[PDB]
Assembly symmetry: C4
Homo-oligomer: 189 residues x 4
């Protein structure tokens, strides 16, 4: 109900009480600049040495991709980011008529799986995309990274994914949701 | 569990967290005058120029329908309103023995999909049916109109229906219910 | 989820919001005298004119049944009460080793479906079974009678059973459970 | 939903309201000493008269098993305890890389089904395993023993297992979870 449990030969049969207290999440960043046509080119005109650098993962990998002027519309930025296989995925939310936002989400959950973004050679587009440790309508975190916290027979376990299989001998716990406050889920193997 | 998610070719696979905070509702009005026989004629005797005007929808359309004396019982009013295809639907609730109420509900959900009712040439029936801006025993709002509010990866979306398909690229979300307070539903495409 | 909805030809299709606030319950009475053998005869020896009178139902019916001395053990009282088709049903709860209680429950739910019990010609057994308006280890109410309260499109409906079919035109609502505080169940016919 | 109900011929048909307030649990003890290789031998070198005594059950049985030096690693302790058929089951939790804990859990639920552990002839291993009445880094209770508390038609029942079949005549209740605070589960046989 709050998780699924698959079992191997190495599992020791007994009574278990499980608390799921947090689920692993993936950081998400989202643009805040008002964009009213997703096809509209947001970047400066004529730049030939523009690039976007994404830092993502654990351990972190940096990916630098070039961007032509044609590629600075939300639709083409998304397509570019997704093409990069850079450890994040990008998608466009249509808040309403003539109101669009680009969302960049880590591909991997975890408290320590944060994203950064840095545009080089285009301050205008940077003021829409750039994201790092400090902030001032700039790119904004809208989902916080976090690990899964769950307790197995009173013992607290923290992991970066929701598929916990490196904890209990011969058991995988695929986390689906939290368990109620004063109510661990009593299970029996 | 709090919604169903259908997917198209254009969807971008990733981790999503969803909050559903409100569901779209349809305004409902309900009579408050004590009526003890649903077949009993509630209107004045002998009027030949009686009508009911319903305003409903977005954008709003006005519908004027005539009502003969025979048509001013709850049962026939309901049948008249429903026959009108006027953007509202009408039904009789039997609170108990000898205690009936007529309910008129917008056909379309939304914060801005409000109903008005105006009887012309029958002050008595009007004192049962009329509903507008200014209002003991007159027609009364009993369900408030509202939009759906939900958040997709931390980004707030407001819509007038519970079938949200104009938000995320290649995703429909058919909302079924709210999600718990401190607990967005973690999904994976 | 909080109820099931069956539909007839007379139903008017539209948007409905439902609150279930209370479910109909059946009064239950339960003995409090310590009884350690369910076969043990609890009544006085030698009485030949003993009887139990049950009042139950709506409208109420009185049923007077005789009881031989052999019939004053919990097991035989239960069997006697159940044989009477007197509008209540009786069952024995085994709280633990050598600790038994007889439970008499109305056969019909409702705020106004209360039980009374009166033994005639056996004060000893009376001090275990008798139940009426005033009380002083005597028979005790342990489930309170109540009607179902639910609201349909903002309109409050009260009924004595959990199968509400005399309210909305061509709809039955079989109530299964309450709905959350600030959260009516949005349905669509 | 909060329990399953199997029925026999002896059941008396009627209306029942059930509260489940607690589920029976099994005591669990867990090591607190930092262990970074589950294969590493935790006991003293050269001892030939080492043993572990487990007290478990209701009524309690004592089991004394010998332990060779090779057997004092978490992996082998677990295998030894499980081999003993001593009324407890043992399993290793991997809190993280180089961080292991041994968990010993009663095989039987109940408030009165507590475990003790006593090592003889190995003060060092004892400082990891020993558990009794008087207790930083010693064996620790992490799940408390408890009975099932549930109420059936307002009458409180306490039992040491979650399969309650010695309470109501011809009914078993296999408890799955608690029921909400102000909301007993209304059932009908
Ligand atoms: Zn971590
Ligand atoms: Zn700038
Ligand atoms: Zn709602
Ligand atoms: Zn008037
Ligand atoms: Zn709106
Ligand atoms: Zn969560
Ligand atoms: Zn009533
Ligand atoms: Zn007396
Ligand atoms: Zn519990
Ligand atoms: Zn020591
Ligand atoms: Zn006990
Ligand atoms: Zn209830």
């Amino acid at each position: 109900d709050a998780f699924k449990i698959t079992t191997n030969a190495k599992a020791v049969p007994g009574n278990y009480v499980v608390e799921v207290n947090k689920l692993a999440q993936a950081q998400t960043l989202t643009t805040q600049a008002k964009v009213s046509d997703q096809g509209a080119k947001l970047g400066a005109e004529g730049v030939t040495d523009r690039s976007l650098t994404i830092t993502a993962g654990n351990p972190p990998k940096e990916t630098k991709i070039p961007l032509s002027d044609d590629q600075t519309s939300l639709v083409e930025l998304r397509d570019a980011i997704n093409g990069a296989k850079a450890g994040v995925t990008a998608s466009i939310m249509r808040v309403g008529d003539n109101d669009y936002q680009l969302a960049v989400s880590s591909s991997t959950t975890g408290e320590n799986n944060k994203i950064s973004l840095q545009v080089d050679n285009d301050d205008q587009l940077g003021d829409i995309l750039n994201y790092n440790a400090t902030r001032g309508t700039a790119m904004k975190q809208t989902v916080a990274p976090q690990d899964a916290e769950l307790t197995v027979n009173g013992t607290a376990i923290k992991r970066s994914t929701n598929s916990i299989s490196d904890a209990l001998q011969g058991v995988t716990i695929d986390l689906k949701t939290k368990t109620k406050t004063d109510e661990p889920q009593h299970l029996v193997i």
